[PDB]
């Protein structure tokens, strides 16, 4: 309903296992006296700031961590107090996704990142290396196929390669440095130059977007794409004989995809902060709690070590984690908006030609302000 | 709000199927008949003259936007939208009825997306969307 002292109200997006989360609220209600209402309102991540301290928010909100930094800056999130021994149960790198001004402000739940997706019928062994991809495309083009198609319009999709040799968004101990912006170092330039030589040498096309690349891979026309777990469901339906694996290296260095951590925050205006902590620790963030959620809709890879090791028996899950651990935590600061717009323009202009990779990156370096 | 402007531009595109920036009466009648309605050319022309401040025979997006802004009882319109989905009048929108209308409109959804739209709308978990559930989603904005 509205927030009431002695009950919990939870917000989580419609695509997650909210009926699985409601089962965990039921068990919590069985054990304690405490009722739990799991809700999935539309646009909850937009409504939370409008409504947070008027009593019509939730005690608990699940979202991608990168929105929580803005929330924390507006004073909407309680500071979280998990003991050192609770924190050990989760992979250490996930705790770095839920800090703001050094303070913990959410519980990590699940982890997502881009991976290399490949057609095992067209390419039984995936390339370990970005550099070996052009040759592959020569071989596949001679069979009427192509090596690789992924979305070239969104910096989120091309950033794994631009970052591999030394690029980054803002330099990370436990706070971000909005001065130190790594889009113009030699690494970023070498990464984007390779991407651009791919297009120049006609191994990829600058206009390819999400829809174009998904259709191609799911019809068996290209041997690889780059995508996240959200995309597996359409690939299953396609019945393409596909694998999911670690991203190709570049100049011997791992591709560095952005990491997104589904996290649970506690409303700073809540009179149920202790019950919320109790519900999240040792009900949700447990093998059986994350399982009830996963059985409703799959979480992908999880922050909780013990249950990830079970889920990672699926090698697509193992691959998502392995790419996450090699990746860059998406900054949760609001200057990310300037970074996004800056780098979207640089890539489209550089890839569209008539724009020096060196020039576009210099201007993108500036436009983060 | 600019987020809502974009949402309305998408709604504009449903009618402007050739994407020339204008809505004709032919484009209007194509969508309404896709929804099982039976308008005359006169009712089609009237619907467009009401919005077309230019006098040319078409609605452009500024005209469309000005009109969307202009309110008191959207309840009727939402009820009318419910009734179009609920073609057998049994009080519940099923996956089949959702798919029926979306395919009539040219909206591409996989079976899983249809099922997922049903699930999220389906507050009480009976597997179908009743009127209050429909209203909950339609009024989020």
């Amino acid at each position: 309903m509205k927030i009431e002292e002695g009950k919990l109200v939870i917000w989580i997006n419609g695509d997650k296992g909210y009926n699985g989360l409601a089962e965990v609220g039921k068990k919590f209600e069985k054990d304690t006296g405490i009722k739990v209402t799991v809700e999935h309102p539309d646009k909850l991540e937009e409504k939370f700031p409008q409504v947070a301290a008027t009593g019509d928010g939730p005690d608990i909100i699940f979202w991608a961590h990168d929105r929580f930094g803005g929330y924390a800056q507006s004073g909407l999130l309680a500071e979280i107090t998990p003991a050192a021994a609770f924190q050990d149960k989760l992979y250490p790198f996930t705790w770095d996704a839920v800090r703001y001004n050094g303070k913990l402000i959410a519980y990590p739940i699940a982890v997502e990142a881009l991976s290399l997706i490949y057609n095992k019928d067209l390419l039984p062994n995936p390339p370990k290396t970005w550099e070996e991809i052009p040759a592959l495309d020569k071989e596949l083009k001679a069979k009427g196929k192509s090596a690789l198609m992924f979305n070239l319009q969104e910096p989120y999709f091309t950033w794994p390669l631009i970052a591999a040799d030394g690029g980054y968004a803002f330099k990370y101990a436990g706070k971000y440095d909005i001065k130190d912006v790594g889009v113009d170092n030699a690494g970023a330039k070498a990464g984007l130059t390779f991407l651009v030589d791919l297009i120049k040498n006609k191994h990829m096309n600058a206009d390819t977007d999400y829809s174009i690349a998904e259709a191609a891979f799911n019809k068996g026309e290209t041997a690889m794409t780059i995508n996240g777990p959200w995309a597996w469901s359409n690939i299953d339906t396609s019945a393409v004989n596909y694998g999911v694996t670690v991203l190709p290296t570049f100049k011997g260095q791992p591709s560095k995809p952005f990491v997104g951590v589904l996290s649970a925050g506690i409303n700073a205006a809540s009179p149920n902060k202790e019950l919320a902590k109790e519900f999240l620790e040792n009900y949700l963030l447990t093998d059986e709690g994350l399982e009830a959620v996963n059985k409703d809709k799959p979480l992908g890879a999880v922050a909780l070590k013990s249950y990830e090791e079970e889920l990672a028996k699926d090698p697509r899950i193992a691959a998502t984690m392995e790419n996450a651990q090699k990746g860059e935590i998406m900054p949760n600061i609001p200057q990310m908006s300037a970074f996004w717009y800056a780098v979207r323009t640089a890539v489209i202009n550089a890839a569209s030609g008539r724009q020096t990779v060196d020039a576009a990156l210099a201007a993108a370096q500036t436009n983060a302000a | 709000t600019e987020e809502q402007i974009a949402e309305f531009k998408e709604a504009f595109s449903l009618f402007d199927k050739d994407g020339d920036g204008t809505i004709t009466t032919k484009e209007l009648g194509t969508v309404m008949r896709s929804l099982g309605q039976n308008p005359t050319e006169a009712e089609l022309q009237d619907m467009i003259n009401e919005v077309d401040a230019d006098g040319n025979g078409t609605i452009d997006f500024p005209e469309f936007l000005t009109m969307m802004a202009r309110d008191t009882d959207s309840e009727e319109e939402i009820r009318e939208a419910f009734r179009v989905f609920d073609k057998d009048g049994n009080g519940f929108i099923s996956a089949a009825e959702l798919r029926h209308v979306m395919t009539n409109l040219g909206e591409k959804l996989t079976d899983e997306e249809v099922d997922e739209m049903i699930r999220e709308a389906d507050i009480d978990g009976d597997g179908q969307v009743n009127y209050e559930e429909f209203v909950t989603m339609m009024t989020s904005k």
Binding site: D42 | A11, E77, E80, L98
Partner: peptide, 29 residues
């Protein structure tokens, strides 16, 4: 009135929200 156009826009909202939601989960458009 413009009852029928508004009703049709309302009918389409279900698809707009699902589409916008899907794009954000797939990190694009």
């Amino acid at each position: 009135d413009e009852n029928a156009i508004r009703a049709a826009i309302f009918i389409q909202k279900w698809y707009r929200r699902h589409q916008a939601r899907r794009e954000m989960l797939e990190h694009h458009h």
